[PDB]
Design a protein around this motif. Structure first.
Motif, short mmCIF file in Angstrom:
data_model
loop_
_atom_site.label_atom_id
_atom_site.label_comp_id
_atom_site.label_asym_id
_atom_site.label_seq_id
_atom_site.Cartn_x
_atom_site.Cartn_y
_atom_site.Cartn_z
N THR A 1 0.74 -1.22 0.00
CA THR A 1 0.00 0.00 0.00
C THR A 1 0.79 1.30 0.00
OG1 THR A 1 -0.28 0.12 2.40
CG2 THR A 1 -1.97 -1.16 1.16
N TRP A 2 2.06 1.24 0.37
CA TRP A 2 2.89 2.46 0.48
C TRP A 2 4.22 2.17 -0.18
CZ3 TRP A 2 5.51 3.96 5.72
CH2 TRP A 2 6.29 5.09 5.55
N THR A 3 4.58 3.00 -1.15
CA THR A 3 5.88 2.89 -1.82
C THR A 3 6.64 4.17 -1.54
OG1 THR A 3 5.03 1.41 -3.56
CG2 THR A 3 7.17 2.49 -3.92
N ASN A 4 7.77 4.04 -0.85
CA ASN A 4 8.53 5.19 -0.35
C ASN A 4 9.73 5.43 -1.26
OD1 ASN A 4 8.45 7.12 2.11
ND2 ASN A 4 10.68 6.76 1.73
N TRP A 5 9.98 6.72 -1.58
CA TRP A 5 11.16 7.16 -2.27
C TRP A 5 11.93 8.12 -1.37
CZ3 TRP A 5 8.93 9.14 -7.58
CH2 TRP A 5 8.54 8.03 -8.39
N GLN B 1 13.35 7.44 9.80
CA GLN B 1 13.24 7.60 8.35
C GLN B 1 12.34 6.52 7.78
OE1 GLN B 1 13.99 10.60 8.30
NE2 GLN B 1 15.96 10.87 7.17
N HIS B 2 11.63 6.86 6.71
CA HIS B 2 10.67 5.92 6.11
C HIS B 2 11.35 4.67 5.63
CE1 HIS B 2 7.46 9.32 5.72
NE2 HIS B 2 7.55 8.82 6.96
N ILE B 3 12.60 4.76 5.16
CA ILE B 3 13.23 3.53 4.70
C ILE B 3 13.36 2.59 5.92
CG2 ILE B 3 15.59 4.42 4.86
CD1 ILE B 3 16.07 2.76 2.20
N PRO C 1 10.34 15.37 3.95
CA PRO C 1 9.65 14.47 4.90
C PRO C 1 8.15 14.61 4.76
CG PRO C 1 10.46 16.38 6.08
CD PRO C 1 10.89 16.56 4.64
N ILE C 2 7.64 14.17 3.62
CA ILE C 2 6.15 14.14 3.45
C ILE C 2 5.60 13.08 4.41
CG2 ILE C 2 6.36 15.01 1.10
CD1 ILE C 2 5.40 12.34 0.04
N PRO C 3 4.28 13.10 4.67
CA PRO C 3 3.79 12.23 5.77
C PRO C 3 4.00 10.70 5.61
CG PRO C 3 2.21 13.99 5.36
CD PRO C 3 3.23 14.03 4.20
N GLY D 1 3.20 6.94 5.24
CA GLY D 1 2.21 6.24 4.42
C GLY D 1 1.89 6.85 3.08
N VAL D 2 2.53 7.99 2.73
CA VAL D 2 2.24 8.67 1.48
C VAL D 2 3.24 8.28 0.41
CG1 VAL D 2 1.85 10.79 0.24
CG2 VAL D 2 1.17 10.63 2.61
N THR D 3 2.76 7.73 -0.70
CA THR D 3 3.61 7.33 -1.76
C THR D 3 4.14 8.57 -2.49
OG1 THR D 3 2.58 5.18 -1.92
CG2 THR D 3 3.60 5.99 -3.86
N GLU D 4 5.47 8.77 -2.48
CA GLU D 4 6.06 9.99 -3.09
C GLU D 4 5.69 10.11 -4.56
OE1 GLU D 4 7.67 8.34 -0.72
OE2 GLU D 4 8.47 9.87 0.65
N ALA D 5 5.54 8.99 -5.28
CA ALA D 5 5.24 9.07 -6.71
C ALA D 5 3.95 9.85 -6.97
CB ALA D 5 5.13 7.67 -7.35
MN LIG Z 1 8.40 9.17 2.65
#
Ligand SMILES: [Mn+2]
Ligand SMILES: Cc1cc2c3c(c1C)C(C)(C)C[C@@H](O)N3c1c(nc(O)[nH]c1=O)N2C[C@H](O)[C@H](O)[C@H](O)COP(=O)(O)O
Ligand SMILES: Cc1cc2c3c(c1C)C(C)(C)C[C@@H](O)N3c1c(nc(O)[nH]c1=O)N2C[C@H](O)[C@H](O)[C@H](O)COP(=O)(O)O
Ligand SMILES: [K+]
Ligand SMILES: [K+]
Ligand SMILES: [K+]
Ligand SMILES: [K+]
Ligand SMILES: [Mn+2]
Lengths: 496, 496
Positions: free
Chosen positions: B162-166, B187-189, B223-225, B227-231
């Motif tokens: 559900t969440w793809t992080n960049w 960090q999201h990673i 640092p967007i929230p 669970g938010v997919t950067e794409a």
């Molecule tokens: Mn992120």
């Protein structure tokens, strides 16, 4: 005479340096002269010499603004200050501060009395001047008076005659024959005024000399020790006895080549309104008047074509930063060394509005002390914040040998990256505070006490085994041969 | 394609801007390329494009340094950043940060899958590459490895899809088919890596794409929230769905025009040595290695004549300041507003080595809150320092409406003159700390906790009745007609 010993020659030196603009058309002392000067200070332009000041009568007076402000170039940044001291215009701040400190372990050279001088070319008695009729500047639009006194030297002497103090303290015109101004602890003018008040017999004999020898106005702005006559310190620093003439109406002595001399008294009983004034920290609080000291003027003497120097003080950069800050830092440097603290250099960063002093530490010496940050912070803070020379300074930043404290960018970097807020700092609440800093006198706490801090930007190994990093910069993160190759090829590759 | 959507077009935009130097003679990736780049960053020169890198084999690879660094001019200071976002090169920091924030209340525009793209022009399997044979730069002389990864985008996805992080996190070459690097909380990673570790079944499918769409690398550094997919955020900000292609060896998707793509896994069990590295705060601690994350590389795909972007990070000014600092400040601005705090603007002053954020307060709104400094400081600090977006920031400076927080000189002035040390500050010791700041990880206290402060540079009347000073500057201490007269006559009088 030499530029450092004669204000008129100093003006001619700035002209010859191409560091003067002579403005020969009429300029209004009501704001315009100070607005021009303000712009010069904010832009590090040439000093303005107003030869045609609306209101000038019978030789009183021309105005030189920005006498101790900065030049645009990096190479002669401090040239105007150097011209105060017979130093090359390319002198560094280290060299200027060293010069100002050099008399501290020399015997004084007391002044020489001479029968007359240029300051006696013209005179005006009690019945021939009115201070409200002179072209005294209004320096900032909300100032509470016309600040005649921004760059002259007050001269007062202890009742016993043993100490004669020269200092800059502001004063404004109160009426035809009086000024008002700041006389506050711990300043020497205040310390002497207290002596006369406790004797209780007479008002303080006083004079105020404008356009004094440039070396004298620098010592006037320096917190040299209690009881030390500035005239003899200037003599030692310059290697020449200063020539003084006696006042006509009192027995004080003024520099022979003073442009303008007021003679009279500082009252031990009377006060009058002073302020507000646009001040060194960059603010004016309109309406904010307070009772200050009151001076009576009995006599004016002056040079033909007299020139009044003026500081249009406020935001960066003017005399209040270049002189108050730097000269306090110089005295603090020496104070620390005399207290056996391993301080090599001190400077008040302009970026801090000269409320900080950065202290460069000889960390080889620090490591031999086998101490800690908390211990060392407290010891430095107790030495500096309990002494007059730390009066204006609210934050001390301790930095190691890699930092050049005369470079604000490097001070900011060290402070921001090496001092952990809270943990690496000691607050000082039971020390005298500088009420002119807005967070003091207009702040949340006591105007006259506390608000001081020592911020330790020494890293932990600097106390133990030695620096354990290299900077991630061009200088430190690349070997010498590579750096040289890159510099040699820079324009060839296509860079600026 | 447009420069903000295609790295190769971004390079051609910098050339056309006269903001690129192409260096077509051989340059050594062992320090020389990074030393040139370092000098560029310290002097705000043109970005270097190394077309002839000693060691480049079979199209791997050219290097572009300083991709997000500053230009010399004030007018297009942020031009390189603007070129990431389809903004005019004269865009202000406010405009750039607004652009980066604009997707926060837009529906996402999810990516578009396409069958192929330039990133598939060349490929190398497990038996055809060796990462130690590529011309990976040694960026600083004491670095503990060759940091291949300074400006690529790691791509990881939650186990549930559900969440793809960049994001950008550093990584260095460990051996022929592995990298090591930092994967740290919050960090999201790291957050995603934790999810896979708790499932416990497989290593994390991973890819690392270098020379991605410039708008994507900016979101990668923000640092967007959670669970938010950067794409999809990039899609909304740009108003266009990003085109992605599938990896060959896993089911993740990479930008179609990526210059270089590594495919493989991030281990849930293995570690390896990472560091030291010359880092954003301006330091390297030689010898300081720590076990980090370990990545296995299974496949490399790349564009013909691939270009690797590189950050030669350290002292001012590079991508770590312009992007980490500014983009965290942007997210903090929004975070405060969403918590009903009257913050108009936020920026991380470069002078603070981006460890401070200055928050401009709408003081009309503040006065309606009928609160106090202590109360307000605590409330701002609790919102920011307990949130991921405040992670890197150790000092918040609150300033009123007169201060432009994008001007470090004005932030420093307000901080120095309006915030009484101690009394006007609240320390925060039970919050997550940023261990890369030397006073944290190499300091006197816990590396991961505390050392944070809120410094209130609001003056007392700003909470009650309104600002009660004027600045002692040219702008505020002189009426408008006078100021205009002085400016009109400036060169006529003889000034610069
Ligand atoms: Mn992120
Ligand atoms: C260079 C310079 C110094 C000062 C001032 C100015 C200038 C230009 C004004 C422009 C007039 C602004 C005013 O705020 N001002 C000023 C003042 N000291 C005061 O007690 N009162 C003042 O109103 N100092 C600082 C003092 O000159 C030094 O602190 C010195 O150390 C004092 O000498 P001493 O008491 O140590 O003998
Ligand atoms: C622009 C930029 C950002 C970062 C980094 C670099 C650059 C150039 C390096 C040059 C590689 C230096 C390195 O210290 N680095 C870095 C890093 N974050 C890490 O966890 N680890 C890192 O090693 N960020 C910051 C992160 O990119 C941001 O904090 C972002 O918000 C993360 O994304 P997310 O977790 O919010 O999705
Ligand atoms: K003095
Ligand atoms: K420290
Ligand atoms: K991100
Ligand atoms: K305050
Ligand atoms: Mn004195």
């Amino acid at each position: 005479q030499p530029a450092h010993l004669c204000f008129r020659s100093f003006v001619e030196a700035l002209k010859v340096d191409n560091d003067l603009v002579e403005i020969n058309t009429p300029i209004d002392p009501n704001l315009e002269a100070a607005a021009i000067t303000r712009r010069v200070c904010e832009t590090n332009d040439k000093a303005p010499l107003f030869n045609n000041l609306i209101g000038m009568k019978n030789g009183l007076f021309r105005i030189l603004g920005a006498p101790g402000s900065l030049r645009k170039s990096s190479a002669d940044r401090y040239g105007r200050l150097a011209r105060h001291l017979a130093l090359p215009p390319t002198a560094s701040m280290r060299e200027i501060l060293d010069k100002m400190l050099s008399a501290s372990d020399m015997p004084p050279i007391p002044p020489t009395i001479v029968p007359t001088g240029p300051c006696k070319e013209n005179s005006l008695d009690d019945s021939e001047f009115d201070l409200t009729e002179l072209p005294v500047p209004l320096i900032h639009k909300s100032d509470g008076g016309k600040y005649i006194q921004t760059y002259g030297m007050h001269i007062v002497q202890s009742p016993d005659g043993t100490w004669t103090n020269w200092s800059i303290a502001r004063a404004m015109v109160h009426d035809k024959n009086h000024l008002t101004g700041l006389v506050i602890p711990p300043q020497h003018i205040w310390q002497i005024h207290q002596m006369w008040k406790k004797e209780g017999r007479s008002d303080v004999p006083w004079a105020l000399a404008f356009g004094v020898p440039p070396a004298a106005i620098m010592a006037s702005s320096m917190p040299i020790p209690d009881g030390v006559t500035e005239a003899g310190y200037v003599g030692a620093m310059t290697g020449s006895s200063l020539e003084l003439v006696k006042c006509d109406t009192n027995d004080l002595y003024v520099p022979a080549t003073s442009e303008i001399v007021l003679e009279g008294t500082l009252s031990i009983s009377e006060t009058g309104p002073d302020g507000p004034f646009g001040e060194m920290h960059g603010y004016i609080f309109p309406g904010d008047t307070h009772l200050g000291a009151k001076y009576k003027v009995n006599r004016i003497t002056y040079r033909n074509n007299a020139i009044m120097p003026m500081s249009s003080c406020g935001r960066l950069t003017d005399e209040t930063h270049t002189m108050i800050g730097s000269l306090a830092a110089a005295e603090i440097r020496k104070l620390c060394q005399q207290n056996d603290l391993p301080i090599t250099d001190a400077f008040a960063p302009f970026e801090s509005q000269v409320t900080w002093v950065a202290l460069r530490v000889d960390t080889e010496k620090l490591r031999a002390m086998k101490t800690t940050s908390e211990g060392f912070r407290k010891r430095v803070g107790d030495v500096v914040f309990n002494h007059k020379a730390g009066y204006t300074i609210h934050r001390l930043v301790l930095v190691g040998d890699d930092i050049d404290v005369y470079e604000g960018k490097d001070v900011l970097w060290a402070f921001s990256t090496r001092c952990r807020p809270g943990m690496d700092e000691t607050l000082f609440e039971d020390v005298r505070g500088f009420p002119l800093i807005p967070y003091m006198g207009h702040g949340n706490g006591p105007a006259h006490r506390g608000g001081k801090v020592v911020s330790d930007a020494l890293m932990p190994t600097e106390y133990t085994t030695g620096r354990n990093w290299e900077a991630a910069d061009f200088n430190q993160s690349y070997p010498e041969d590579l750096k040289q190759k890159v510099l040699d090829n820079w324009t060839k590759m296509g860079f600026s």
